[PDB]
Every structure is written in C-alpha cells, then in structure tokens.
Design a binder for these strands. Structure first.
Ligand SMILES: [Mg+2]
Lengths: 626, 513, 116
RNA sequence: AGUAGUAACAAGAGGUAUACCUCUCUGCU
C-alpha cells in the first residue's frame, strides 16, 4: 500500500475537508536581503501597464509623472490602467441614486468626527516612515519628531492639540525654502525641492511571512505628513462601506456569513423553471498597480458634492498627495569577489550614477529601464497605488460596478449582484439562457475594464449557484466554512505569569467566537497552552517527578498547604480551565477553594514585586534589556 | 464655521493631479460637482474592441491532462534528523544521579552499547574533506568520556572549524576601496535546479503513519466537565488522542521540539562555543514505565544572530542501521561512517548488523528554530480537520454525528493506492494520516509548497463543482496549469504532493468511466 | 520576538527585577540551596534582580495580610463567576454576550439559563 | 563545505598597529 491523503476526497466533498489543503504549520517564507529588486520591479511593472498615457514634467518636484486616465481604450486581456473618468463619475452617481441619503449622512458624520479628533490619534497604528531620519519608526516617535521639527521652524498651529490644525501646519510647511533639520554632528539645510520630495516619499520594504506566494513582493509605508489625510479619507470611506450591503469590509466573524447567505437567499429566491443562475468566484489581477489616484480624486469630489468647500479640500488633499508620490528604493545591493575573497555594500542613491558592469543581465536591464525616473534616489510613482493605503475606496468602486447590474437599470436579459472585498469578489448572475449568462459576464468584465478593475482570467471560475468561495469563506449549500485567518500558536506572549494566563484564555475564547474554533480543538488548545506555560515559567505540578530551579519551593508549597486544588498554576496547582469558564480570571475561579493563609500570602499589597485580571505576587515585572 | 485653503505651492501641486484635459483644480471640481450623466458607459462599451471579453471554456475532468513533474537528478533528503532510519539507544526507567540533565542521560544511554569498533568511512560526502568528518567523530567520542559537569563545549580544532565553516564568509570592506576588481559582480540569483521525483519519500510517508509501541504525547488535565458541549468535546478529543498518540508522527513532533528547544537555548545562552547538544526523547511504554531514548548528537557553531534569517551552522551525527549504499541518491549531502556492531535477538533468528553514523553539516535560522519549537500545532490542526468534518456532517443531518463516526469499526475511508486498487482503512488510519500530513508539511515547509497548495485548491474545487452537477467552466485554464507547475522545482514534498494530485485526478477519471 | 525573549530570559538565573526593599523581608540563601537575590541593579533604575524562588518563597512563607475587600475591588470578575456557577445548563440544540463562545457555535447551539 | 533561493547568512562594529583586547545559566514523563 502507498498512502495518499487526497484520496480522502473520494468519500467526502472537497468543501468539507478543504482544511487539509492549508499548509499552515511550517515556517512561512521570508526574504533575505534587499527589497530593491522587488521595488524596482513594482515601478517598472506599473509604468508598463499605463504606457500610453502622457508624460508631463512636474513643476515642483521635478519628477517625471504619468497620466493614464482618459486615455486610449484597451484592446487585449492584459491588465491596463486607462480608466475613463466619466464612467467613474457615472457609477458614483448611480450608487448615489440607488441609496438616497447615503453620501450626505456619511459626510455629515465625517464632519462631526473632524472637529473632535486629537493629534494623538496619529500615534496609534503600525510603523511609519520618518523623513527626519530616513528610517521607519514607531508612530509616536515619528509624530513627536515631526512636531518638534515643525516647532523649531515657524509652524506652531498644532499647539491646540487638534488634528485639522496639524494638517494646516503640514500644508503650510511646503512654503519653507529653508527647512533646517538636525541630522547625524551637523544641522543640514534642506532646500524646498528636497523637502517637498522628502514629504511625498513612501518607504518600501519586502512583505515577510505571507502565505500563498512563491515569489516575493514589495509593500510600502507612508510618511508622517500623509498619515492624517489618509486617516480622514479612510474614515469617510469606512462610514460609507458599512451601509452598502454588498461590501464585505470591515465586518467579520459571524456577521460576514450572514452576508453570503443573504445574497444567495436573495438572488436565488424567485427563480422560474428557465431562470438559470451562475456564480463567478474571482480574484483581481494587479489590484495595486492599476487604480490611479486621480480616479480617487474624482470619487472623493463626487461623493462630497454639495458639502462645504473646506471639507472637499481637506478630503481631496490625500489623492493630490498620492498622485505625486515617489518611492525610496530600499537598501542597495551586495557585491562579491572570489578572487580577492571580499564583499561590499552599495546604497540606493548610487544607482542612477554607477557603472553597470557590476550587475547581472536582468538587474542591469531593470536599472536601465528605471534610470529615467530617478529623483534624488527615489523613483517617481504617479500611476498606480501601493498596497494597504486605500482599502475602502476601492471597495466603494467595486460595489459601484456591482450596483450597475439591477433589473431596472440594465433592462437586458441578465442581472447580477454579489459581494466585493478589498480585491476579492463573488458575482452572482441570473439570466434566462446560458448565452445570456455569457453576455452578462462580458458586460461585467468590459465595464470593469473602464475603471481599472481587472478580473484575473487565470484564477477565476464559474459554476451554478450553491458552492463558491469569498476570501477563504467556503460556501456549500448554506454552510459556510471559515479559513480566512491563520490558526495561531497558542503559546505564551511573554509578560508575566498572570498576564500571560489571562491573555491565553481570552485568546482561545475569541478564537472560539470569531474563527469557528471547534470545542474539541479548543480543549486541545487549552492543553497545549497549559503545557507550554508550565514549561516556559518552570512551574510544573507539585506531585511531579521533574526538576528545575523552582521545584524545591514548589514541592514545599505543594506539601505544606492543605486544599491543594486551590493553588494557581504558577504555584504548581491544578489547571481549572474548561470551555464554560474561559472568561473568568484564575484568581477568582479558585477563591472559595483557597485556604486563607495562602490567599493572604498571595494578595498582600506590601510585596515589592508589583487582559482584564487581578494583581498578585505573580504579576511581577521582568528584567529590562541592559 | 471651519476654514481650510491651499497655499500656493500645494495649489501648483494640485493643478497637476487631474485628468489630462483639465488645467485648474477648481475647474475640475466645478466639472465634477455639476456632472449629469447621459449614458457614457454604453458609448464606451460600444466603442471598446471585441477582443476584450471573458470567454468561458467549459470544464471536463475526463479530458484534462495530468500535472507534469520535472526532470533531473533524484531529490535528496533535507530534514534536520533522520526520519525512518534513525536508531535509538534506550534506558528503561533511569536513575543515574543526573536524572534529566541531557548530557548525563546521553552518557547513560551511551554506556548501554558495547561494540565500538574503529570508525571508517563507507559513503563519502561528494564535495567534502571526509577525514574532517572522521576526526570530528573521533574528537567527540574522546571528549564525551572526559566530561566533568552538565555541559560539554568542544575545543576549536581545525577540522571542527571546517565542519562548522568558520572563516568562509569573505571580508566586508568599504565600496570606495575595492571598486576596481575584474571579478567583482553581484550575488548569484539563479532559480533553483529542477529535480526528478525519487521513490523514498512515499516510503517515509508510509512509515510515518504506523503505530509504535510507545506513548509519545502526554497532555495535561482539564477541569470538571458540566456542559453537554464539553462532554461532546471530551468524547471527540479522547477518541482522537487515543488513536493518534502511539504513531511515529508524534515521535517526530517530540524529537523536533526537543532539538529546536535545545538549539535555541544553547544559541541564546552560550553563543561562542562549539556546544555539544544531544537528541533525546522521553516516552512511556504500554506498561507505564518511563524510557529515555537517545538518537544522536548535534555540535553547534557560533551564533551571532541579529536578524530573523541569520544562519547558525551545526553538525548532526545520528546513529542508524540503514546501509546507505542501497538508495545512494537519497544521501548526497551526508557522509556515512560505520562505527559499530549490534546483536538482534528476535523471535526468528539471532544475528549481527553494522551500526552506521550519519554525519552532515546543516544550518538553521532563528525563525526555523521558533517554528520547529511549535510542531505541536500539528496535533491541533489535524484535529481541527477531523472535527470539522463532523460538523460538516452535522449540518446535513441535523444531529450529533459524533458517535456514528468513531464507532465505525470497518474499512470505510479510502486512504491508499496499492497495485490491487484503491485501499480503504478505518477512521483511526485517517487520523494518523492527517497528523502525518501536518507533520510533513511542517518539516519540509518551503515556498513551493505554499504556491502549489494555493494554486491547486482551485482545481480541487472545480472537480468538486463538476461532481455535484453544477456545470463548471473556466476562462483561462492553461494559465492555471502554468501557475501550479511553476511552483514544482526541487522540494521532495512538493513533488510527492503533485504526484498525489495526479493519482487523485486519475482516480476521479476512473470513477465516472 | 517577546515570547522568545521571555523563553531565553527565564532560562537564565535571575529574570525578575524586584524592588530595592526586598532585602528586609526575605533572605539571600534558601533552605534548599538557592540564591534569592544578588546585589545587582537594573538598567539605571535601582531595582535588585531576583530569582523566581523568591516569588514561591513569598507565596508559601510570606507575611499574611487581610484580604476582604477583593469581593468589592475586583467585583466584576466574581460577578462573572457567580453568574456562571449559579446558572444551570440545557440541551445541545442542533440546527449572553459574555458566554457567546459557549452557547452559540458554528452549527450547533446550546440552551443556557443564567443564575436566577 | 553547508543553509537557502531571484539575495542573503557563512560574524560585525573599534584600539594599538597586521597580532591580541572591551562591547554588540539550557531538565516540555
Ligand atoms: Mg476570491
């Protein structure tokens, strides 16, 4: 016999045991080295889809920009960026017609949220580029450095603490032709062109630990001055996208399965004996490199129509900043020699003015193709978006295309509906014959080609309605299996005893709530977490036969106290947890079981040692880095 | 009221962020804000060319072709330890005054093997100085017997520095000093060379699903069960742990956990010496008496790790009884000595066999040691497959399908392909096979596996959509085939998984005639 | 990585930074041969490094104080406990916000009346 | 040599000066 697990699919459907085709227990792939090859590949691939635009030299930054929209219509199935803008304004007007009062209510609540936002709301979130250092930093440090450098020069409008005043300071700071920045010493002086290029810079790294890609890719982090406008625009688009029923974002958990079952219940309700219904499961190819920011400017100027003009300007800043962006090309390259047996490192700013006899064939071709885009070590990137920035406006545009296909609007022999999330879409098409379904697919695909949305012909497939997949939510006949998120390691997080205990139990609880964790898997996760906990803090049970540095005093504490079921795990007591009591912290679960001398020795405030938990002597503070 | 206006510099920026036929930002705002459409989309869709359409080609799995497997040399082993070939020296219920310290247990297991002959080479490393491997084993055998303490650190000899590769990294200069060498070039960035699928990895996955006579994984206690869903969960979990514990995949889990834990502790504690690390697992018998098994030694190198991908080299020396001269393509990386003789007194005969030692120079990183410390997730994930299928049968029957799913003492599930046809086993064989699949997905994990699984899931779902009479169809199937087939280069697990998909596709062809 | 940092920091002898007034209550040596504090300090802040045997020593042989305000200080956690333990369960019906991991699953559900 | 895979690790930052030196205890039955 030769063992084959895929033969399991001969007995069950594939939708039941699809969790065997997810190899998420080994290490995900990482990238060793520079992200310069990937970022130059992104720039070259972006300027090769919008090739028939118009090249205009930018007046201020001096960089060569490219304008794809209102351009020639495509004539193949390769991805193109030529989005006609009257079609974009038409789809936004139709989305306004189908939902009365939507854009006004979203804009009204955004204006309500603008005048009561403090500047420390920028401190939240992930890392951020810092142009005073040319380095990624935390958001709080980059914000503090930007406020300090603005305070040295004559820009102090953010003294009131608000955020719109800090954006006023940001816009006013482009006046200064004499920006002096203390660099590592000597305080160097930026000119106006250098500061204006440094403000519009995205810092590009390689995305590590991603699942489902053989070859790596590049992602980018925005600057500090462009974080606030992006936050306000994403707030408006978030307030819109929560009210379109065809938007998969930003909800999740059990409030996403209801959307799939709702659109299947709607679109397959009143089907006659002839009313065929098909379903396309589809991914979009090149979702980043084809949505132009000027299309987003037309969208945020059509959405905010009739609003006060300060609102239109404040929300229109972010596409204007994004259509002039540059890209920092990373950390150079590494050269070697095996005769003299030595290696060297070259930086990114030498790429435009080096001899090309040191590179291979393909990288020399890449430098020759990117050489005419260099501005002070950065490459101009006017066409195309980069990943992660505008995640809800793209969903708004896709929902507009899905809202084109109503019966009252089309008046054809086909109609459609469905869901769109980020760059993942599920489209349900009803018609009378199969050729009507084919013509409806053609109308959808050709309409998507007019706004930059490119359906991937390789990774999409169509069948009859009942089984499909939307962002790794697998729907079969009314049953949704969720495999969107990775099954996390249920180990300790590394704070202390009590903090890691409470964090682990609440993590298993929220995974049972959100990501469909079964009860038996939850019990085995409790077992694995307590096993790794008792190893990590050297706090195994009292009656054990092991030996560590704590087993002497743990042994004495076990033998001396009487009600042995009342000690905590870090005192070598028994694990009390099960499925019904994951939300209770450990000190409260064993309160009535503790003998009062042990409890009084535990929760004394006078000890020198000192998640929603109690405070005991186990809540100590670890050794800092020396 | 609120106020926001542009400065002149940002205004000259904003006049260049428009559609190309405009010239002023306020003019484009006035065009957008007073736009009344007149069916522009119909004019564009009548004006766009007719090559731009999503044509449907209908899917038929009785006509599609098999996935291609590449050509080259046979694929060789790349695991950190020997999987089905390793031999273990055992101590039953140890009490030797160290009692858990790994070097004391390694000495206690080494003293139960007499028959140390003079070590000679029987399979050479192809690109190595094999006398350095022989002298590394002789130096380790000398330095074990003279240890006084809890840790052994080796003397920095010449052959040990070659075997760990010290001094092989070239020097790092400034660019302005050496920019005038004719030999200077970029680091080599070729794609990997393709490899033909060999015949041993199917044997490894065969033997990694069979029961053994030990009880490997020992879980903790749980609280007092009260709720009925806790009783259902306890039923499912206790059947699974009763059926999955004694398999070899649990032994590989425990061995990988112990090796990577000891490697990370010696890397972050003593990051200067050549620290000898032993390979220990601890198990019980079916009678309950403890047992300590030793598999081999690992000599660490220097570990100045600052990134998450910086590599520490090590030398792994593992005992075995498999003569490597019968499958010699499997061991291109190794260097195999012959170090002893062992007496097998079994129920049939009473013979002697030579005991070999497999020596190789491997390397690992910090993220690989971290993810190898957490191989116990395999024991989770397979359960979350099997239990999930139970829920997948509870939503089309609307009852607790727990009990008529584990009390099915009958060969029901297909799991194999013999030369007689497709073979069926019980549900416990499925649990052991899914645990072995998760373990081998964690040992041989690479990027090609991610690409292959993520691109073959659509072929599985298309075949499933065909078999439910849902009439599937695709738009570009050759691109899907090429996107799968580019991710099959040289990993043995990816080549074996593509062979498994080819056999599944031929089986579902033969199902419907 | 903070988890790996905790794992290699607990392997060393002195991982816990205790306050500098620990020397007036608990001695240096153990009854079993372990050291409970050195005379080191932390990174700039004068807190003397200890071993976890000091924590277990305090838990088994510390100064007993009075703890009666904890049913009122951390009252919401004991409220969770009492609403769990005084509530009775029900059947598994195949087809509040706190226990939604317990009484509302992927396919099944469970009747659960709370305490009272 | 070896890990690995579209580019890297195979020690690096320094002092006197091509040789030395400061910094950057490990027990999962
Ligand atoms: Mg999709």
């Amino acid at each position: 016999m030769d063992v084959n697990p895929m033969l399991i699919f001969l007995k069950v459907p594939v939708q039941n045991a699809i969790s065997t085709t997810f190899p998420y227990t080994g290490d995900p792939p990482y990238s060793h080295g520079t992200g310069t090859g990937y970022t130059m590949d992104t720039v070259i691939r972006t300027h090769d889809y919008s090739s028939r635009g118009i090249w205009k030299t930018n007046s201020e930054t001096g960089a060569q920009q490219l304008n794809p929209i209102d351009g020639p219509l495509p004539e193949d199935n390769e991805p193109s960026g030529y989005a006609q803008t009257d079609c974009v304004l038409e789809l936004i007007e139709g989305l306004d017609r189908s939902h009365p009062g939507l854009f006004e209510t979203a804009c009204q609540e955004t204006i309500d949220a603008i005048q009561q936002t403090r500047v420390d709301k920028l401190t939240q979130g992930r890392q951020t580029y810092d142009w005073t250092l040319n380095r990624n930093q935390p958001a709080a440090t980059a914000l503090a450095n930007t406020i300090e450098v603005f305070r040295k020069n004559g820009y102090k409008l953010n003294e009131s603490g608000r955020l719109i005043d800090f954006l006023k300071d940001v816009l006013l700071s482009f006046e200064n032709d004499s920006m002096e920045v203390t660099t590592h010493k000597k305080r160097v002086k930026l000119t106006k062109k250098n500061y204006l290029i440094r403000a519009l810079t995205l810092n590009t790294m390689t995305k590590d630990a991603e699942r489902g890609k053989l070859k790596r890719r590049a992602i980018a982090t925005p600057g500090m001055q462009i974080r606030g406008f992006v936050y306000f625009v994403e707030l408006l688009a978030r307030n819109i996208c929560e009210r379109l029923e065809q938007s998969g974002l930003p909800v999740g958990g059990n409030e996403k399965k209801a959307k799939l079952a709702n659109v299947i219940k709607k679109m397959m309700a009143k089907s006659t004996d002839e009313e065929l219904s098909y379903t396309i499961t589809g991914d979009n190819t090149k979702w980043n490199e084809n949505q132009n920011p000027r299309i987003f400017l037309a969208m945020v100027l059509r959405i905010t129509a009739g609003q006060p003009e300060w609102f239109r300007d404040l929300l229109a800043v972010a596409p204007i900043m994004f259509s002039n962006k540059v890209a920092r090309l990373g950390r150079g390259y590494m050269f070697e020699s095996k005769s003299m047996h030595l290696r060297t490192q070259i930086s990114a700013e030498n790429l435009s003015d080096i001899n090309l006899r040191y590179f291979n064939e393909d990288t020399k071709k890449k430098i020759e193709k990117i050489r005419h885009l260099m501005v002070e070590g950065t490459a101009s990137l006017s066409p195309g978006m980069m990943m992660g920035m505008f995640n809800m406006l793209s969903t708004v545009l896709g929902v507009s295309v899905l809202n084109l296909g109503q019966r009252e609007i089309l008046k054809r022999t086909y109609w459609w509906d469905g869901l769109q999330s980020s760059d993942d879409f599920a489209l349900i098409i009803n018609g009378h014959f199969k050729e009507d379904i084919q013509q409806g697919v053609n109308h959808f695909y050709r309409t998507c080609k007019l706004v930059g949305i490119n359906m991937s012909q390789k990774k999409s497939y169509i069948n009859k309605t009942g089984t499909f997949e939307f962002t790794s939510f697998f729907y079969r006949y009314g049953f949704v299996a969720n495999f969107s998120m990775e099954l996390p390691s249920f180990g300790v997080a590394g704070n202390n005893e009590s903090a890691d205990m409470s964090i682990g139990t609440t993590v298993i609880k929220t995974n049972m709530i959100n990501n469909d964790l079964g009860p038996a898997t939850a019990q085995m996760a409790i077992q694995l977490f307590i096993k790794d906990y008792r190893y990590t803090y050297r706090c195994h049970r009292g009656d054990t036969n092991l030996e560590t540095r704590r087993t002497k005093s743990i042994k004495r504490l076990w033998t001396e106290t009487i009600s042995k079921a009342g000690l905590l795990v870090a005192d070598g007591g028994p694990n009390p947890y099960n499925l019904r009591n994951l939300h209770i912290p450990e000190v409260c679960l064993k309160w009535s079981l503790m003998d009062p001398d042990y409890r009084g020795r535990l929760c004394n405030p006078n000890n020198p040692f000192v998640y929603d938990a109690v405070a005991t002597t186990h809540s100590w503070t670890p050794k800092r880095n020396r | 009221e609120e106020e926001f206006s542009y400065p002149p510099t940002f205004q000259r920026l904003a006049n260049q962020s428009l559609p190309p036929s405009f010239k002023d930002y306020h003019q484009f705002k006035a065009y957008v804000s007073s736009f009344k459409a007149n069916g522009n989309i119909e004019a564009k869709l009548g004006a766009m060319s007719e090559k731009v359409n999503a044509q449907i080609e209908s899917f038929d799995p009785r006509t599609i072709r098999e996935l291609e497997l590449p050509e080259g040399k046979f694929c060789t082993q790349r695991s950190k330890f020997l999987l089905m070939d390793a031999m273990k020296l055992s101590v039953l219920n140890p009490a030797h005054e160290g009692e858990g310290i790994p070097m004391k247990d390694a000495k206690a297991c080494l003293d139960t093997f007499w028959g140390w002959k003079k070590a000679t080479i029987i399979k050479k490393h192809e690109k190595g100085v094999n006398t350095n491997y022989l002298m590394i084993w002789e130096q380790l055998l000398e330095s074990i017997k003279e240890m006084e303490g809890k840790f052994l650190n080796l003397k920095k000899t010449n052959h040990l520095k070659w075997g760990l590769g010290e001094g092989q990294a070239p020097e790092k200069m400034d660019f302005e000093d050496c920019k005038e060498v004719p030999d200077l070039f970029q680091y080599k960035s070729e794609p990997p060379e393709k490899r033909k699928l060999a015949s041993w990895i199917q044997s490894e996955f065969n033997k990694a699903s069979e029961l053994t006579n030990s009880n490997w994984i020992e879980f903790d206690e749980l609280g007092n069960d009260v709720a009925p869903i806790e009783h259902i969960a306890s039923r499912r979990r206790n059947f699974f742990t009763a059926e999955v514990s004694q398999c070899r995949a649990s032994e590989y889990i425990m061995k990988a956990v112990y090796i990577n834990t000891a490697l990370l502790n010696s890397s972050c504690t003593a990051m200067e010496e050549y620290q000898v690390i032993p390979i220990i697992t601890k198990c019980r018998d079916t009678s309950g008496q403890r047992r300590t098994n030793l598999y081999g030694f690992i000599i660490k190198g220097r570990s100045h790790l600052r990134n998450d991908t910086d590599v520490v080299n090590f030398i792994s020396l593992e005992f075995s009884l498999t003569d490597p001269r019968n499958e010699i393509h499997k061991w291109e990386k190794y260097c195999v000595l012959e170090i002893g003789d062992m007496e097998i007194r079994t129920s049939i005969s009473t013979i002697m066999k030579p005991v070999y030692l497999y020596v190789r120079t491997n390397g690992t990183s910090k993220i690989k040691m971290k993810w190898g410390m957490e191989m116990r997730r395999c024991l989770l994930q397979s359960l979350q497959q099997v239990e999930s299928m139970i829920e997948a049968e509870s939503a089309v029957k609307e009852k607790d399908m727990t009990e008529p799913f584990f009390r099915n003492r009958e060969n029901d599930w297909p799991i194999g392909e013999s030369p007689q046809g497709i073979e069926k086993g019980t549900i416990g064989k499925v649990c052991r096979v899914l645990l072995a699949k998760s373990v081998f997905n964690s040992i041989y994990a690479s990027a090609q596996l991610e690409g292959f699984s993520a691109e073959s899931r659509k072929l599985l779902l298309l075949i499933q959509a065909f078999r439910d009479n849902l009439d599937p169809g695709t738009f570009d199937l050759k691109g899907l085939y090429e996107a799968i087939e580019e991710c099959i280069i040289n990993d043995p697990w990816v080549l074996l998984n593509a062979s498994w998909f080819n056999s599944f596709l031929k089986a579902v062809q033969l199902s419907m005639g | 990585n903070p988890a790996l940092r905790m794992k290699w920091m607990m392997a060393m002898k002195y991982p816990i930074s205790a306050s500098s007034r620990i020397r007036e209550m608990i001695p240096e040596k153990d009854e079993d041969g372990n050291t409970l504090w050195t005379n080191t300090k932390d990174a700039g802040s004068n807190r003397v490094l200890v071993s976890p045997n000091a924590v277990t020593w305090w838990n088994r042989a510390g100064p007993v104080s009075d703890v009666v305000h904890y049913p009122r200080v951390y009252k919401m956690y004991f409220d969770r406990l009492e609403r769990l333990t005084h509530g009775t369960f029900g059947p598994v019906k195949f087809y509040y916000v706190e226990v939604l991991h317990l009484t509302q699953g992927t396919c099944w559900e469970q009747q659960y009346t709370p305490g009272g």
